[PDB]
Design a binder for this molecule. Structure first.
Ligand SMILES: *[C@@H]1O[C@H](CO[C@@H]2O[C@@H](C)[C@@H](O)[C@@H](O)[C@@H]2O)[C@@H](O[C@@H]2O[C@H](CO)[C@@H](O[C@@H]3O[C@H](CO[C@H]4O[C@H](CO)[C@@H](O)[C@H](O)[C@@H]4O[C@@H]4O[C@H](CO)[C@@H](O)[C@H](O)[C@H]4NC(C)=O)[C@@H](O)[C@H](O)[C@@H]3O)[C@H](O)[C@H]2NC(C)=O)[C@H](O)[C@H]1NC(C)=O
Ligand SMILES: *[C@@H]1O[C@H](CO)[C@@H](O[C@@H]2O[C@H](CO)[C@@H](O[C@@H]3O[C@H](CO[C@H]4O[C@H](CO)[C@@H](O)[C@H](O)[C@@H]4O[C@@H]4O[C@H](CO)[C@@H](O)[C@H](O)[C@H]4NC(C)=O)[C@@H](O)[C@H](O)[C@@H]3O)[C@H](O)[C@H]2NC(C)=O)[C@H](O)[C@H]1NC(C)=O
Ligand SMILES: *[C@@H]1O[C@H](CO)[C@@H](O)[C@H](O)[C@H]1NC(C)=O
Lengths: 264, 208, 208, 209, 209
């Protein structure tokens, strides 16, 4: 349905300066492509094709980029931006939960005074002699249009570009499937905590913890998304659910509690 | 000469937007001399290529069965788009073309009433909530159960029984633990029928 | 040639001593040239001569149909007596014998619960009294509806649906007038199943 | 140079199987010297000819406006499929392309609460039933009202408003006659969001609640 | 080609005496070669130098933006005084004049109704009270909540929505802890509008409705 390769910025700032260069990596985990990537660069009524024998594409021009792996559809647009302006707000291309978003209020080789990050056209934070804004844990509250403003030496208070920080879920909210929600007593019923991991974050393993009504099952977390119960009796017929977590246990999503009944 | 059969999509698939309705064309009794079958599908006479062909599987009578399924979405199936399953075979002197569409007829709106469990069952270990759905035509219906926005999985729906006045009626018994019922939890009955307002009707029922 | 078929007696026929259970061994496709269908009935391999043979009838496919009905005892049926129809015809090189008997599954007692109509249905002109007969095995059951000791025929009973635990459950919707329902009349859901006490359980419901 | 604006399908049309979701790309400031505009529709990179182009409309400022409607089905739109509208004109130095798709982000199940009218509204001739719909993402929701299975057209719905959590919240005011409220009548708030189970929730509200 | 925009004072600052209303004259598209803009601020017909022109601000697109904010008294804005700014720039042959004033229409008194949380929401950690403000005109209103004479800053107000009567309505939802709600705390929804008596109306709302 969605075999779209993802382009990864390096540095992750989608907006950079004129002399700087960024490397665009057409990362394909499933349906991998170490080479032969057809880049559909487009700036202004352009369909420029620049094929490279590697997975990287070092560029220094603005526009909208995408890559096309072998046997794979076109990639999502990447709105690169190279600015000659005196102040820009560098933001990561993709923001996921649990990330450390660093919205840099970086000027063009100048120490801009009185920086102030505006979220949704109102003051959010103040950076006195500082540039790097920091969100320690990105969530849905950290959505909107950010834009930093700062006084120059004596020329002009300069407003930077607007970057839309949209936070996407690293994995879909888990749903606890089971082999049967009404297992006869003495039958093995396998729990399943499926989470459709986003293709941006697919190399990160997931740890699943399966629960009874309020008592955890097994020994903490486990990389296996299937918790097999050899034989469940009538006692343990309660609200079963699961918790899907990333490898640092930073962002944890709780599955809806599906009731499992035991038939006898 | 292999035989051609057609199966319409199930009502649940065509009545829930969360699911994808799939129309299944089944070709059986395929001779091993000419097992290659080419499938063509029509949407109001306009050729389409969204159909995918499943791998053939041998039958017990030394024949082959190949099934072609066309991806359809609900709006085109509901208004009555004519779908033609043309089966091309060399053994058959001519290809077999047959016409399928939604069964045309007057729709009657279901009257969803949800009934609390009998007081005789309140002393049992498991109450049985009920969802009578009567007076609906045709029988293409889907009934589900919900609790706090999540589907219950211990419900069984009786087949649609023809009523006296030519309509249909059925039930939906959800077996809920008596403890959950006695804390005032809300259990809703979801009915997805063509004749409804938005093809949906959700009638909740609590301890009240 | 002729075909031999054997059918069990009706579920209400055997469980009530007031009704007469009958086993029908129906023979179809009887040739006109050889219409003499010989009927012999064996009760656990013991020949009996109390059976009744109906006259033949003309069929739509230019054949004949001869039916033999044998009156059986309820004790002689539910205890597990193997019945046999010996069908011999001049078109049949050998006699074709069909066998029927009581289903040997383990009985499970039904739990009859009677549900009053919902408050939503009261706004309608005809309420629908429902009777849930759940947790019964096998499917050989009969449900009636008697008001003030007199059975009435306006109800519809859903086919027995398999429950989650392997038993069966059904429903019976009786549509009575709203004014008649709230006039104070009492209605009963009579259940005739083999696993009950005396093969009978009747539950009443009213406005209260 | 003429401009092209692309408009996503309304949230109502993308969630009901009984509704046709359409996406429109209109063009403004069309010069009368070149009144011929060729429309090419692309869905996920492949050309689709299902679109029907409406006739041109005359404007007040001596320009022309052309609207092209292409009808999709909801499973394609809800999966995040891209949509590109191609406009070709003689006066245009280059064709203008715009891309629209469903806004990405974490879904959140709205919590539908129906609030009965205040005690100070029963002195009025008409009561104002309320359906608070809080905690959903994105702001693609359709909220309706219905009594006894029939639609109600006397409701006005506020636009989604961002809460503190970042999820939106919405309000729906249905104005009904006080006679129809003081009796036994059940008005249900029909909430359709992409995050709810079966994309639907129906919260009943009557005098007893 | 510089352009100017006149923005009316936000309705919250034009009604409370505590805060001050300010009519802003913002210019944009001011190139480097012609960056000098002088604002001639007029109250009704005369020129008043009470304005405080903020310095030029260089946007990201290398075009400047000069904002001249003139503070005004509520007694003049609420009486429909026509504020205008004359922007002088080297691009336009003549100075550009933009004129705005109060929304002129028959004022209608809002009907504030406070709605307690639904019983379904009385199970969550935080309940959300509601303040339906109905049937006012114009859409220049301020809604602020209070608990014990001290303001509560956990509310979000929907923008005014046009009704069938021609008036407006909005809902102000304030979220508080259920612990505070169950003790019987009083939450009064203060509403400031020009049509109300003394431009104020509080509707108290506690656990006993
Ligand atoms: C060059 O950039 C400037 C500045 O634009 C900013 O930076 C660029 C790079 C982008 O990121 C922009 O998105 C970003 O805004 C552009 O100037 C903009 O020009 C347009 C049209 O010329 C103006 O829109 C028009 O004005 C209003 C809407 O303006 C209100 O709402 C905006 C958000 O939608 C705010 O940003 C505005 O400040 C304004 O908000 C009001 O502000 C006053 C002042 O305090 C308050 O008193 C009001 O209460 C407040 N109102 C609200 C709703 O909060 C509208 O009539 C209509 O949409 C007009 O199109 C933009 O206002 C203007 N932006 C700014 C910040 O001034 C230039 O157009 C760019 N040059 C080129 C060549 O494109
Ligand atoms: C000569 O006069 C014409 C008048 O047609 C002017 O065209 C107008 O240009 C302006 C400026 O670019 C443009 O305003 C932007 O439009 C977008 C939003 O559009 C929606 O609102 C306008 C209201 O006028 C409707 O016309 C649109 O169709 C949109 O309304 C609804 O939009 C939703 C999605 O949001 C869509 O689903 C609905 O179908 C649609 N409703 C209908 C009935 O179609 C935004 O980009 C932006 O916010 C601006 O408002 C305006 O739309 C143009 N008018 C049109 C297309 O009719 C010319 O500019 C003018 N020429 C000169 C030189 O002055
Ligand atoms: C910079 O910020 C400081 C601290 O808020 C403030 O006092 C000062 O006036 C600002 N300087 C300018 C030039 O705006």
């Amino acid at each position: 349905r969605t075999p779209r390769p993802i382009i990864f910025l390096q540095p992750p700032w989608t907006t950079v300066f004129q002399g700087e260069r960024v490397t665009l990596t057409c990362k394909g985990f499933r349906f991998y492509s170490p080479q032969k990537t057809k880049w559909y660069h487009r700036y202004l009524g352009k369909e420029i094709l620049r094929e490279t024998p590697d997975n990287i594409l070092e560029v220094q021009e603005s526009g909208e980029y995408r890559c096309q792996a072998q046997g794979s559809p076109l990639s999502s647009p990447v709105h690169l931006d190279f600015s000659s302006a005196s102040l820009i707000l560098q933001a990561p291309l993709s923001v996921f939960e649990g990330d450390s978003v660093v919205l840099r209020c970086r000027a063009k080789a100048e120490v801009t005074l009185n920086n102030t990050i505006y979220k949704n056209d109102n003051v959010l934070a103040f950076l006195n002699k500082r540039t790097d804004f920091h969100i320690p844990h990105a969530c849905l509250k950290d959505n909107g249009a950010y834009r930093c403003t700062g006084y120059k030496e004596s020329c002009c208070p300069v407003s930077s570009n607007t970057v839309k920080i949209q936070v996407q879920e690293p994995f879909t909210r888990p749903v606890l499937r089971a082999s049967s929600f009404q297992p006869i007593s003495g039958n093995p019923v396998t729990l399943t905590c499926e989470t459709q991991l986003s293709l941006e974050r697919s190399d990160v393993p997931l740890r699943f913890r399966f629960f009874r009504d309020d008592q955890t099952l097994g020994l903490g977390w486990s990389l296996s998304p299937n918790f097999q119960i050899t034989a469940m009796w009538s006692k343990d017929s309660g609200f079963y659910w699961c918790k899907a977590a990333t490898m640092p246990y930073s962002v944890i999503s709780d599955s809806p509690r599906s009731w499992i009944q035991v038939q006898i | 000469g292999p035989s051609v059969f057609l199966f319409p999509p199930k009502p649940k698939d065509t009545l829930m937007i969360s699911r994808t309705p799939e129309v299944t064309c089944v070709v059986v009794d395929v001779s091993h001399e000419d097992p290659e079958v080419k499938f063509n599908w029509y949407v109001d006479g306009v050729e389409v290529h969204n159909a995918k062909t499943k791998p053939r599987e041998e039958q017990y009578n030394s024949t082959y069965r190949v099934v072609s399924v066309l991806t359809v979405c609900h709006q085109d199936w509901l208004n009555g788009k004519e779908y033609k399953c043309k089966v091309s075979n060399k053994a058959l002197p001519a290809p077999i073309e047959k016409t399928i569409s939604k069964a045309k007829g007057q729709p009657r709106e279901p009257q969803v009433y949800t009934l609390p469990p009998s007081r005789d069952e309140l002393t049992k270990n498991q109450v049985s909530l009920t969802c009578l759905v009567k007076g609906f035509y045709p029988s293409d219906i889907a009934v589900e159960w919900e609790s706090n926005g999540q589907p219950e999985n211990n419900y069984k729906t009786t087949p649609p029984v023809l009523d006296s006045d030519g309509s249909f009626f059925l039930y939906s018994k959800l077996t809920v633990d008596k403890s959950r019922w006695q804390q005032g939890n809300v259990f809703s009955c979801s009915v997805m029928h063509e004749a409804l307002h938005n093809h949906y009707t959700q009638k909740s029922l609590d301890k009240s």
